[PDB]
Each structure stands twice: as C-alpha cells, then as structure tokens.
Symmetry: C5
Amino acid sequence: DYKDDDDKLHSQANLMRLKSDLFNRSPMYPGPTKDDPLTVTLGFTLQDIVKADSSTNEVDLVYYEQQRWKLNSLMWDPNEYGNITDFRTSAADIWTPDITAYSSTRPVQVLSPQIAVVTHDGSVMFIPAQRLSFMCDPTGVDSEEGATCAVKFGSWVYSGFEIDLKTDTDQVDLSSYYASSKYEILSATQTRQVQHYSCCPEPYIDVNLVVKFRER
Amino acid sequence: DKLHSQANLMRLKSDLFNRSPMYPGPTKDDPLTVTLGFTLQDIVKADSSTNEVDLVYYEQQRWKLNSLMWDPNEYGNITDFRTSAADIWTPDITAYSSTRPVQVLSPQIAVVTHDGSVMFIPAQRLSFMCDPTGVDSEEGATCAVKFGSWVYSGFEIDLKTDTDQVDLSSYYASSKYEILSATQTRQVQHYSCCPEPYIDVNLVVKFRER
Amino acid sequence: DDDKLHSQANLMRLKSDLFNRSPMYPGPTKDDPLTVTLGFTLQDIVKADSSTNEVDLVYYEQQRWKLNSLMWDPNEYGNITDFRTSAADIWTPDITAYSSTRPVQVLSPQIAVVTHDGSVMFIPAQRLSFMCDPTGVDSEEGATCAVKFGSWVYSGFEIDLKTDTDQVDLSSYYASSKYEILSATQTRQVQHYSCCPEPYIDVNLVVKFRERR
Amino acid sequence: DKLHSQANLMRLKSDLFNRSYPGPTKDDPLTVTLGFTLQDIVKADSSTNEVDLVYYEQQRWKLNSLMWDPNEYGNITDFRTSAADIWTPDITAYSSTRPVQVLSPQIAVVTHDGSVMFIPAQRLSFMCDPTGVDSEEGATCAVKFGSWVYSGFEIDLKTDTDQVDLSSYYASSKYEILSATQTRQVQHYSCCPEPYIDVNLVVKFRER
Amino acid sequence: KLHSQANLMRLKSDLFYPGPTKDDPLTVTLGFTLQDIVKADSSTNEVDLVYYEQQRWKLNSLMWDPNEYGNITDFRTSAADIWTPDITAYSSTRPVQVLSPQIAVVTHDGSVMFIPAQRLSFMCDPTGVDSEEGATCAVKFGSWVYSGFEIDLKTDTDQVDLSSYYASSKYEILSATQTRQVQHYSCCPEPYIDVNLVVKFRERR
Ligand SMILES: *[C@@H]1O[C@H](CO)[C@@H](O[C@@H]2O[C@H](CO)[C@@H](O[C@@H]3O[C@H](CO)[C@@H](O)[C@H](O[C@H]4O[C@H](CO)[C@@H](O)[C@H](O)[C@@H]4O)[C@@H]3O)[C@H](O)[C@H]2NC(C)=O)[C@H](O)[C@H]1NC(C)=O
Ligand SMILES: CC1=NCCC[C@@]12CCCCC21OCCO1
Ligand SMILES: CC1=NCCC[C@@]12CCCCC21OCCO1
Ligand SMILES: CC1=NCCC[C@@]12CCCCC21OCCO1
Ligand SMILES: CC1=NCCC[C@@]12CCCCC21OCCO1
Ligand SMILES: CC1=NCCC[C@@]12CCCCC21OCCO1
Ligand SMILES: [Cl-]
Ligand SMILES: [Cl-]
Ligand SMILES: [Cl-]
Ligand SMILES: [Cl-]
Ligand SMILES: [Cl-]
Ligand SMILES: [Cl-]
C-alpha cells in the first residue's frame, strides 16, 4: 500500500543519510598509531591448490581471507537511523589494513568484489578471495607425507605497536576445499607469530599459513 | 524532431541520475530479486594438470528499481535507454570457484526500461575449478560452478532463473568440446559461520571431446 | 607567430563550444538512429591454436559515423575544417566481436578525427583471439573461420551498420605471415532473435587461410 | 634560497599549466625528432613470426607555449614533469602484435626554449620472420614508427642520424646485431590523399 | 585515543613538492634484500628476481615539531600522497610487478622510507649456473630522468641483504653486491649515478 511504498523510500533515505554522516561529514580514519593500536583478526578458507611448479618452486593457492577490525569512528546508534544495524560499502570508502603475503612471487589476483560489511558497533568484515603464487618447493608432493609449504601474512608498513594480528582458531577452514583438486590437504594451519628483525627494535606480527598437501 | 528526441533522453537521464536521489543497494527492508541466465558460447580449454576449465559465456542479469521508473508520456514516449553500467547500481554476482579474475569480453552498458527494469548482459571468460577426468569417454566429464552475491545474504538479494536450461543456441559448433547438458538451478544454502540463508545459481556442465 | 597563436585559440574555442557548452550525447535512439560504417584492414594471422580452436588476428577496424551535435561552420572558427580528439572526449559506438575468447588488445592510440560536417573517423588497431577451428590450414583448400561484429546493446532500430566494400583490405597484410589469405570478406547481415522484437545488424568477417609454403 | 628555488619552480609550473596546447594543425605543424637505442632482441618466435625488442625511443619537439624567461623564475632553465602534464605525440609502431610494455617512468624534461625530451623504454612484439637467424647472413626485419592519427600536414618526423644507437646493446643477448638503421620515409596510402611520415627501423641480426 | 587521531589528521592536513633540482638536490639511499631467483631462461637470457628495494630520502618540506602535534614522531601514508624517486632498472625486459602496498613511513625529521617488494625480469645469461663457479649477472638501478646534480644515489653497505633469501629456491646465491657507480654518456656532460646489483648464483645441489 502507500504506507509500504513510504517505508521503503524512508529506509533508503536513512541508509544514504547514515553513509553521508559517517563518510562525508567525518574525515576518513588516518590508520592506527602507537597510542591507538588496532587488532585485525585474520582467518583463511583454502579453496584449492591450483598448481605446484617444481621448475620454479612456486605454488598457486585460491583462498578467501577474512579480515575483521573495529573502529570507534564507524559506530552509530541504529535507533537514530531507522534501526539500520549494518550496511555493505565499497572497500575504497573505508580504511582497510595493508595485510600482505611476505613471500609472493606475483601480484595477488583478486577474485571477489571489493565490498565490506560495516556493523553499528564499528566492526568491519572484509573477505577478499585471492589467487596467490608464493615461494614453495613441492618436492615430496608425490609421497605419502606430501610436501610442506608456508607463507607469512601481515602488515607491510605497521609494526606490532600499531597493528596487532589475531586468529580465532589455528585451523584453516577446509569446509570449501575443492574435492577434485589435483592436491589433497593433509593439514592447513594459521599461526600468529611475534618476531624481532635485526634492522628494527619494534615487535613484528604475522600469521603463518602452513599447508601439507600431496597429489590425489 | 530528432533534436527534441535527443533533448527528451538527456532530460530523462538528468532527472533520474541528478534530481532523483540514487539507490544505495538492497537492504532487509527493501530486498532485491536478481534474475540470472547463462548462454554458453564455448569451453575453450580443459587443463588436466591443474583441474581448471575455461568457459566463454554471457550472463544475463535482470532486476527492477522503483527509482529507475518514469512515464514515457512525460519524455516524448521514450520507453527505454542504454547507459554505462557505472551510472547505475549493479549486483555483485560472483563465481564462487573461479581460479583467475573473470575477463570481460563485452561493453559495460545496461538497458533501463520505463518500469525500472534493468537488463545487463556481460560476456565473460571464466577459469574455474573442474576435473575434466572422463572428457575423452562417451559419458564425458561433469563440472559445476555456483554464482551469487559475494556480500549480500538471501535477506537482501534473492536470485531466480527464468529457466533451468542453459541457453546452448550460441554454443560454438566447432568447439574442441561438445555439451551433453547444461543446467542452471537456484540453490538455498546455510553455512556454519552465519545464521541467514545464502542463495546461488549452480551451473552444471557435462561435456566431452568432440 | 601571432597567426599560430590565433589558430590555437580558435581550435581551443571550437572544442570548448562543442564539448564544454553542450550536454553529453546520450547515444542513438529509434527516433534519431545512427549509421556506423565499418571496414577491416587485416594485418596478420599471428596464431592458429588447434588445441583450443582459437585464432589470433591483428587488424585495423575503421569506424565512421556522423552527429549533428559535432557540426560547425569553419568560417566561425578560423576556417578549422577538422581536429583530432581523445576517444574519451566523444561518444563512440560499442562495436564488439561476438565470438572473442579474450579481451581485445588495443595496439593504437584512442584518438579520433572529427570533421565540420559532424563526421567522426576512428581506426583502432586490435589483436583479437576468437573461436576458430583451423582444421585444413595445412591443405590446399585451407581453413575457413568467421567472426561477427556489431553493437552489444543497440538493435537495428538505433544503430545500423554498413560497409563501403565487402572486400577486407589486404593491402597491409604481412607478406611473411605464417598464414597466407585465400579470401577475406566483410558482409552486413540482418538477424532476428526469438528473445526480442527488433532486427539486429552485424558485419560478418569471413577469412579463408592456409599455411604459407 | 632552497625554499626560493622550490617556490620559483612551483610558480613556473603553475604559470605554464594552470595559466593556459590542443596538438598540431595544418597551420601550426610540429616536427618530432625520433631516435632508437636498441638494448636487446629478447625473443624470435619462428612459430608465430613475432620478434620481441627492448629499446628506448628518444622523442624531441618544441612548443612556443612551453617557453619562459629564466630571469623571471630564479634562473630555472629546465624542469622534470610527469608526461601527463603535457601534450605528447602519438608515435606508434605500425606492425605491433601486442600492446607495447612501458619499462621506464613517464617523465619528460622541458627546457626554457620550449623544447621537450621524452625517452620511454619499451618492450615491443612486432611482425618478423626470423628465417636465416641461424646463418652467417642472419635475418632482416623492419617496423615503421609514426603518428597514428596525424598526417605529414600536422606532424613531420626527423632523425638526427640514420644509425640506431647500439652502444647499450646487451653483450650476452641470444642475438648479435649486424646492422640497425632508422630512416625517415614519406608514405602514400591508397586510402588517403595526405602524405604520411614514418621512421623505418630495419634490424639485421643472427644467433650469437 | 580521540586526541591522537585528531592530531594525526591535523598533521597530515597541514603538511598536505616539485622534485629535486641543481639548487635543491636530493640524496636517495638504496638497499636491496634479495628473496628469490624464481626463473632463469637460457632460451631468452632473462632471469626473474623477487626482492625488496629500500629507498630513503629527506625533504625539509616534510619536517614538523612533534610537540606541536601531540608527540607524533612518524606516520604511514600512501606513496601517491608524496613525491617518490623514479628509481628504475636499466636492463628490465618486462614491466616491474609490485608485490607490496604502495605505502611509505614519514618521520618528523623529514625522512621517508619506502620499501616496495618487486618481481623483475632482466637481461641475464645464466650459462654456467650448473657449474661450481655458477653464473654472474648484473642490473643497474638509477633515476631515469635526473642526473647526479639533482639526485645523488648511495648505499649504506655494498652487501645485498640475503638474510631473507628463500632457503628452498631453485638457485643458491654465491654472492650479491650493490655498488654505487658514476658514469658519463656521449650525449650528456653531467655525471649519472647508478647502483649496480651483481648476483652470482648456481643450481641448488
Ligand atoms: C505518445 O503515445 C501516446 C499513446 O499512444 C500518443 O497519444 C495517442 O495519440 C493517438 C494519435 O493522435 C490517439 O489516437 C486517436 O484516438 C482517437 C480516439 O480516442 C481517435 O478518434 C483518433 O482517430 C482519428 O484520427 C486519426 C489520425 O490521428 C485518423 O486516422 C482516424 O481516422 C480518426 O480521424 C486517433 O486514432 C490516441 O488516442 C492517443 N492515446 C492516448 C492514450 O492519449 C501520443 O500522441 C504519443 N506522442 C507523444 C509525444 O506524446
Ligand atoms: C618491510 C617489511 N614488511 C613485512 C615484515 C617486516 C619487513 C620485512 C623484512 C623485515 C623487516 C621489515 O620491516 C621493516 C623493514 O622490513
Ligand atoms: C563471502 C561469501 N559469499 C558468498 C558465499 C558464502 C560466503 C563464502 C564463504 C563462506 C560463507 C560466506 O557467506 C558469508 C561469509 O562468507
Ligand atoms: C547480447 C547480444 N549481443 C550481440 C547481438 C545480440 C545479442 C547476441 C545473442 C542473442 C541476442 C542478443 O541480443 C539481446 C540478447 O542477446
Ligand atoms: C591509421 C594509420 N595511421 C598511420 C599511417 C598508416 C595508417 C594505417 C593504415 C594505412 C593508412 C593509415 O593512415 C591513415 C589511415 O590509416
Ligand atoms: C634515459 C637514461 N636514463 C638513465 C641513464 C641512461 C639513459 C639512457 C640513454 C643513455 C643516457 C641516459 O641518461 C640520460 C639520457 O639518457
Ligand atoms: Cl574508515
Ligand atoms: Cl605481542
Ligand atoms: Cl541505480
Ligand atoms: Cl559526441
Ligand atoms: Cl604541452
Ligand atoms: Cl612530498
């Protein structure tokens, strides 16, 4: 009825007003500082080991990388915005963390839309799907124990003083692993590590993705 | 009256994209149904070293927004127009088992109709996860790829097919592979992570060496 | 020197009046349809892949059309009869290959020539991979393949296509190509589709070729 | 003084770019000087008759709109600028088989007399039959370079020498250069009444 | 924590260069961290390296007083936001592929540190890679458009950092040096500066 038509128009206006209030009126987050450190939660969903190249020692993975963080500057009261509790927005509208593979051999290829979900508590969920080529010797992939490779993910430019990394579990999600891959997974772990590098005095944080796999 | 026709279309586009506020995407309060259909043009390549298959197809997408409606009488009886896909909201329909970024083979232009219906038909080359084992036998190989929103649940975007049969009428007659069958089926799925329903369209292709 | 300074001001003034002082052209309509003239200059058959049935062509695609909105009187602008402009500054037709297997690769600058009669000429050089079974390329008869070109989104009611000739220009064909051309034609076709009421127009490029011996 | 030199350069660029070129015309034609430095023949593919070259292409032209009095800007005589801040000529290979790959930063040098020097390093795949590369006499291939859209009436081309600069040629390339020439040509095409100008690069090479 | 964010936002606004000149020349410190020789192609004499290239420079225009900005001593910013040097490989065969985010660290003294991870294909004959002596290849890095009078190049050390070299690479590094060189060309009277990266490598045994 007319009332239903009005409710939907009102709901669109409230979303456009919320996005306007958060992005246009307030300056974009300048990133974390020593005085305001940001925790980023990382989890991997391994979809496929596409290729294991024994001529270059590169292995190609397809995965989804779940990134979660919470900003005060993205908080709202749903009661002020027609009970909107979250919205979908372009990744380019918000700050995102510079989470990088430390041993890639080619630029990562993005396989999903660059859209994130922002929730009224200021929490952000971003899940880029990626194809990655990384440094991996697949010697032993044709064996019962298979091959073992590892790749570290973390901020490229922020130390543990500015960006802390967390995992909810040390188990890579294999519930979406392609059942007819050339490679079967023996195990896949994701482990937070804290290091000191020779160059620098700050602690450095990474999540180490370790995959044991063999030819099916 | 050609000057008037151009003026009427420039006025219509100006009215819709400036003087009317734009759509910000669907919500639980204002859910959107997207209709999807595939026209399979070619299975270009089936790689048994990586279990990747390369498809060329076009994907018909259709949806309807109240904000893209107009009265043709008020605009010299214009009933539709073509516009850049960047001038309008488009759904984030994604292959769930791609192994490479989709390559776009057609112009990013949509057709908008006076009822607010949009039709967008991107032609694509897709590499996806597929074991071609059996492709060199009479019963052939079977592979499947799901398509849906990456970021919207069933509470914001619903999907539909207008038919469950993939359009094979443009399938390349001299492909290295013949199609035994091609289906496109709406599926409702729950994931352990999340409470909301998730909707996809499952493209299932059975094929063999010509 | 003063003359050169005057000629530049006139061109900058013409371009500004045409683009800055005019609302952007919305494309053709059923009431204001456009004819696009297409012609192909085939430079090379670079690759014929029998494992995927893909063939790679290098060609120049000439496109011509005319808009009243790009017309000017040369006498009003220092007797300027034409100018070069970025293809982004003007409307261009969405002429697409219908059976490509990869995005077209652009080999030339995206710049067009506009004449005072409102006519535009645009000649993109392209590498195209398209669906082609090269079986018989190593025989006297050779292989035959075909690719249709037309608007992706406009019907025959908005965009008509024409050719000046049904003969593909082979005068630039690479004399030392792996493949020699037995024939190459470009033919306007009118098609009807069960989906849709209006006629659809394409230009069918048919190439007969064999391995150079 | 370092602050002043920076102030003067910023003011010169604002004066040249933000104070007020639509390209050459029949009434205002431009001469472009081209010179090639051949660094490597990377690949010669006898299965497709494509050859891959790495070279840098020196481009020089002169505009009245780019000239200034150095005395008015702290005696600045030249500056570096992004190639996107200025008009650049649409010099194209006429027989490329793939889009050119740019190997260098897109930055030009502008001098107070209005002269511009722009030296893009490129990898080019072009149409070339390497038949005979495995013999004493070697293979011969050629590629024309010129404006894609401007005739001889708007852009003329010049070389400073007909000798391609080989002083930077990779000493351990798979291919040794027997000769490399760059020759201005006046072309007539049966499509078109205008004269067309190109520089023809002819390379004679063989397997080392 | 609201005060810290406000002060950082204020600093970046206040701060936000036309590049170096003969009168305002710049020094760029380069250091290489070699991670992997991925590929050596004897059919084309092209070798593919993965490395991190550390670039450091100092601008007076990027200086601030930390006391005026709530004791902020540095910040991270998009490389797009600031001037960066046009340091280029002189013998690449393909465009460099960037493997890391284009973000730099700016310090209150006006110093900038930018560390792009890159994959480079460059001109290299790998003959002898399967021998005890291995193969030797070299690639020069420098400004494409600035002479030694506008950009000086230097290294902190002539030893390439190998502490991150992939232990299971197809190729082991026998040595890797990074050496400032001064050169002259017939065209040009002013001196040109490059850092010459020399790598001696061989098949892992
Ligand atoms: C936009 O579209 C609308 C809707 O189609 C259109 O309005 C229509 O115009 C036609 C033509 O004038 C109208 O048709 C007339 O209808 C009346 C009855 O209502 C008849 O008596 C008329 O017949 C006489 O005139 C004809 C010549 O026009 C003769 O051939 C005939 O022998 C009779 O003498 C005639 O058929 C129609 O009624 C309207 N419809 C509506 C809903 O208003 C409009 O013109 C279009 N253009 C624009 C820019 O809006
Ligand atoms: C640049 C960088 N990014 C990832 C982790 C740490 C590292 C990588 C190498 C070790 C130290 C480092 O930090 C500052 C300089 O380099
Ligand atoms: C991101 C996503 N998009 C579409 C399918 C479902 C999936 C894919 C991964 C598993 C579940 C998921 O739903 C919400 C969070 O992620
Ligand atoms: C999309 C499309 N592009 C080229 C011509 C027409 C065609 C080609 C395929 C069938 C008909 C079609 O028209 C509307 C739907 O698709
Ligand atoms: C487009 C083009 N540009 C450079 C001269 C050669 C060529 C290429 C084909 C022959 C003639 C031509 O000149 C104008 C029209 O086309
Ligand atoms: C463009 C260029 N940049 C760096 C040194 C090598 C080179 C390439 C050609 C030789 C000299 C040169 O220096 C300035 C002008 O040209
Ligand atoms: Cl943000
Ligand atoms: Cl810690
Ligand atoms: Cl919209
Ligand atoms: Cl136009
Ligand atoms: Cl200019
Ligand atoms: Cl800066």
